[PDB]
Write a protein that holds these residues in place. Sequence first.
Motif, PDB file in Angstrom:
ATOM      1  N   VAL A 109       0.828  -1.202   0.000  1.00 24.95           N
ATOM      2  CA  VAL A 109       0.000   0.000   0.000  1.00 24.95           C
ATOM      3  C   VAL A 109       0.872   1.265   0.000  1.00 24.95           C
ATOM      4  CG1 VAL A 109      -1.653   1.315   1.334  1.00 24.95           C
ATOM      5  CG2 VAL A 109      -1.972  -1.103   1.021  1.00 24.95           C
ATOM      6  N   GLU A 110       1.898   1.290   0.839  1.00 24.55           N
ATOM      7  CA  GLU A 110       2.748   2.502   0.909  1.00 24.55           C
ATOM      8  C   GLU A 110       3.423   2.756  -0.415  1.00 24.55           C
ATOM      9  OE1 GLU A 110       3.187   4.914   2.964  1.00 24.55           O
ATOM     10  OE2 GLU A 110       4.947   5.834   2.053  1.00 24.55           O
ATOM     11  N   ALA A 111       3.924   1.695  -1.060  1.00 20.24           N
ATOM     12  CA  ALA A 111       4.620   1.865  -2.325  1.00 20.24           C
ATOM     13  C   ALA A 111       3.665   2.389  -3.375  1.00 20.24           C
ATOM     14  CB  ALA A 111       5.258   0.543  -2.765  1.00 20.24           C
ATOM     15  N   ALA A 112       2.472   1.835  -3.407  1.00 22.09           N
ATOM     16  CA  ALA A 112       1.476   2.306  -4.374  1.00 22.09           C
ATOM     17  C   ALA A 112       1.062   3.748  -4.179  1.00 22.09           C
ATOM     18  CB  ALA A 112       0.268   1.403  -4.365  1.00 22.09           C
ATOM     19  N   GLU A 113       0.851   4.150  -2.920  1.00 23.38           N
ATOM     20  CA  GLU A 113       0.391   5.497  -2.617  1.00 23.38           C
ATOM     21  C   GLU A 113       1.399   6.573  -3.000  1.00 23.38           C
ATOM     22  OE1 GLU A 113      -0.286   5.358   1.597  1.00 23.38           O
ATOM     23  OE2 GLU A 113      -2.401   4.859   1.399  1.00 23.38           O
ATOM     24  N   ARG A 114       2.656   6.213  -3.087  1.00 21.19           N
ATOM     25  CA  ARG A 114       3.709   7.187  -3.450  1.00 21.19           C
ATOM     26  C   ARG A 114       3.860   7.372  -4.921  1.00 21.19           C
ATOM     27  NH1 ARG A 114       2.496   7.550   0.911  1.00 21.19           N
ATOM     28  NH2 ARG A 114       1.653   9.210  -0.463  1.00 21.19           N
ATOM     29  N   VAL A 115       3.057   6.684  -5.745  1.00 22.62           N
ATOM     30  CA  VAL A 115       3.124   6.867  -7.187  1.00 22.62           C
ATOM     31  C   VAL A 115       2.254   8.025  -7.591  1.00 22.62           C
ATOM     32  CG1 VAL A 115       2.585   5.776  -9.440  1.00 22.62           C
ATOM     33  CG2 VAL A 115       3.699   4.456  -7.631  1.00 22.62           C
ATOM     34  N   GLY A 129      -5.362   6.645  -3.232  1.00 20.64           N
ATOM     35  CA  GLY A 129      -5.616   5.544  -2.354  1.00 20.64           C
ATOM     36  C   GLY A 129      -5.633   4.190  -3.004  1.00 20.64           C
ATOM     37  N   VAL A 130      -5.397   3.206  -2.160  1.00 19.51           N
ATOM     38  CA  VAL A 130      -5.612   1.820  -2.528  1.00 19.51           C
ATOM     39  C   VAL A 130      -6.997   1.436  -2.038  1.00 19.51           C
ATOM     40  CG1 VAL A 130      -4.832  -0.572  -2.255  1.00 19.51           C
ATOM     41  CG2 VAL A 130      -3.165   1.262  -2.512  1.00 19.51           C
ATOM     42  N   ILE A 131      -7.872   1.158  -2.992  1.00 16.37           N
ATOM     43  CA  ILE A 131      -9.241   0.764  -2.719  1.00 16.37           C
ATOM     44  C   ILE A 131      -9.352  -0.693  -2.259  1.00 16.37           C
ATOM     45  CG2 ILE A 131     -11.482   0.396  -3.870  1.00 16.37           C
ATOM     46  CD1 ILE A 131     -10.722   2.851  -5.641  1.00 16.37           C
ATOM     47  N   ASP A 173      -3.584  -8.752  -6.332  1.00 18.51           N
ATOM     48  CA  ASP A 173      -4.543  -8.032  -7.163  1.00 18.51           C
ATOM     49  C   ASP A 173      -4.900  -6.760  -6.403  1.00 18.51           C
ATOM     50  OD1 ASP A 173      -6.493  -7.908  -9.269  1.00 18.51           O
ATOM     51  OD2 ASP A 173      -8.044  -8.581  -7.865  1.00 18.51           O
ATOM     52  N   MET A 174      -4.869  -5.596  -7.055  1.00 21.01           N
ATOM     53  CA  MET A 174      -5.046  -4.289  -6.396  1.00 21.01           C
ATOM     54  C   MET A 174      -5.982  -3.421  -7.226  1.00 21.01           C
ATOM     55  SD  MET A 174      -2.146  -1.332  -5.664  1.00 21.01           S
ATOM     56  CE  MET A 174      -1.399  -2.157  -4.310  1.00 21.01           C
ATOM     57  N   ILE A 175      -6.776  -2.608  -6.589  1.00 19.48           N
ATOM     58  CA  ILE A 175      -7.523  -1.528  -7.225  1.00 19.48           C
ATOM     59  C   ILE A 175      -7.047  -0.241  -6.585  1.00 19.48           C
ATOM     60  CG2 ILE A 175      -9.774  -0.566  -7.777  1.00 19.48           C
ATOM     61  CD1 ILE A 175     -10.934  -3.342  -7.330  1.00 19.48           C
ATOM     62  N   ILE A 176      -6.662   0.729  -7.428  1.00 17.48           N
ATOM     63  CA  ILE A 176      -6.292   2.111  -7.016  1.00 17.48           C
ATOM     64  C   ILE A 176      -7.402   3.072  -7.374  1.00 17.48           C
ATOM     65  CG2 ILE A 176      -3.805   1.713  -7.031  1.00 17.48           C
ATOM     66  CD1 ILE A 176      -3.886   3.297  -9.774  1.00 17.48           C
ATOM     67  N   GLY A 177      -7.519   4.133  -6.581  1.00 18.54           N
ATOM     68  CA  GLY A 177      -8.314   5.265  -6.995  1.00 18.54           C
ATOM     69  C   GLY A 177      -7.489   6.219  -7.853  1.00 18.54           C
ATOM     70  N   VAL A 178      -8.167   6.880  -8.779  1.00 17.13           N
ATOM     71  CA  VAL A 178      -7.556   7.911  -9.638  1.00 17.13           C
ATOM     72  C   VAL A 178      -8.529   9.070  -9.820  1.00 17.13           C
ATOM     73  CG1 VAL A 178      -6.069   6.249 -10.885  1.00 17.13           C
ATOM     74  CG2 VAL A 178      -8.312   6.871 -11.814  1.00 17.13           C
ATOM     75  N   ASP A 179      -8.006  10.225 -10.256  1.00 16.51           N
ATOM     76  CA  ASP A 179      -8.824  11.401 -10.597  1.00 16.51           C
ATOM     77  C   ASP A 179      -9.846  10.955 -11.622  1.00 16.51           C
ATOM     78  OD1 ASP A 179      -9.766  13.832 -11.585  1.00 16.51           O
ATOM     79  OD2 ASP A 179      -7.741  14.713 -11.655  1.00 16.51           O
ATOM     80  N   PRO A 180     -11.157  11.197 -11.394  1.00 18.74           N
ATOM     81  CA  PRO A 180     -12.174  10.863 -12.387  1.00 18.74           C
ATOM     82  C   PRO A 180     -11.990  11.530 -13.767  1.00 18.74           C
ATOM     83  CG  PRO A 180     -13.151  11.415 -10.284  1.00 18.74           C
ATOM     84  CD  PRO A 180     -11.717  11.759 -10.164  1.00 18.74           C
ATOM     85  N   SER A 199      -5.794  -2.419 -11.267  1.00 17.84           N
ATOM     86  CA  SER A 199      -6.828  -1.757 -11.973  1.00 17.84           C
ATOM     87  C   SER A 199      -7.186  -0.470 -11.239  1.00 17.84           C
ATOM     88  CB  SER A 199      -8.025  -2.674 -12.170  1.00 17.84           C
ATOM     89  OG  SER A 199      -8.655  -2.925 -10.930  1.00 17.84           O
ATOM     90  N   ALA A 200      -7.999   0.362 -11.868  1.00 16.06           N
ATOM     91  CA  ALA A 200      -8.301   1.709 -11.399  1.00 16.06           C
ATOM     92  C   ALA A 200      -9.791   1.969 -11.365  1.00 16.06           C
ATOM     93  CB  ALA A 200      -7.605   2.774 -12.228  1.00 16.06           C
ATOM     94  N   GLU A 201     -10.219   2.804 -10.404  1.00 20.42           N
ATOM     95  CA  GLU A 201     -11.576   3.361 -10.326  1.00 20.42           C
ATOM     96  C   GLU A 201     -11.471   4.832 -10.014  1.00 20.42           C
ATOM     97  OE1 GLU A 201     -13.777   1.285  -7.299  1.00 20.42           O
ATOM     98  OE2 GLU A 201     -13.559  -0.625  -8.267  1.00 20.42           O
ATOM     99  N   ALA A 202     -12.453   5.593 -10.519  1.00 15.75           N
ATOM    100  CA  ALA A 202     -12.552   7.029 -10.175  1.00 15.75           C
ATOM    101  C   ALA A 202     -12.756   7.172  -8.668  1.00 15.75           C
ATOM    102  CB  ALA A 202     -13.693   7.658 -10.920  1.00 15.75           C
ATOM    103  N   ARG A 203     -12.020   8.108  -8.081  1.00 11.72           N
ATOM    104  CA  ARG A 203     -12.204   8.448  -6.665  1.00 11.72           C
ATOM    105  C   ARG A 203     -12.017   9.924  -6.425  1.00 11.72           C
ATOM    106  NH1 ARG A 203      -9.047   5.390  -1.783  1.00 11.72           N
ATOM    107  NH2 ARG A 203     -10.887   4.657  -0.593  1.00 11.72           N
ATOM    108  N   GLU A 204     -12.883  10.514  -5.596  1.00  8.72           N
ATOM    109  CA  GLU A 204     -12.660  11.876  -5.101  1.00  8.72           C
ATOM    110  C   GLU A 204     -11.685  11.824  -3.939  1.00  8.72           C
ATOM    111  OE1 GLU A 204     -13.631  14.153  -6.914  1.00  8.72           O
ATOM    112  OE2 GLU A 204     -15.285  13.155  -7.958  1.00  8.72           O
TER     113      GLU A 204
END
Lengths: 79, 79
Positions: free
Chosen positions: A9-15, A20-22, A36-43, A74-79
């Motif tokens: 999680v820490e490594a992912a969050e610094r990219v 966030g890691v969902i 297997d990971m899902i990240i949030g990204v700017d919508p 993979s990615a999902e929109a997140r505020e």
Amino acid sequence: MEAVQNRIVEAAERVPGVRGVIHLRARYVGQDIWADMIIGVDPENTVEQAEEICEAVQAAVCGKIRRIESLHVSAEARE
Amino acid sequence: MEAVQNRIVEAAERVPGVRGVIHLRARYVGQDIWADMIIGVDPENTVEQAEEICEAVQAAVCGKIRRIESLHVSAEARE
């Protein structure tokens, strides 16, 4: 496993671009980790940008945590 | 142990003012790691600055590698 998940999680969050890691599922396959990971990204990022962020997470996390031998992001929109 | 030593060296090298890890001895005390490290520093840093860098390495390394329960850091001049 908590310690390895925290590192993931820490490594992912610094990219750049990760909001966030969902979700994160990790399991041992022998002494290796498959995850297997899902990240949030700017919508408002484009799909292409989101796929770039996912690839950058895969590189960063696999680079930092040597026991990981499979990581799907993979990615999902997140505020 | 190689994997934990690699993590220790990388964490130390990313601290401002570290000019390499000169020496690292790590050993398991139960499931904990106890370690002794020597870093290189600018010969023209003051003693006070060198001790600050050593303290910053101790914080960075212990922060990143949760199994470490003792880390002593000393410094030598290095080009």
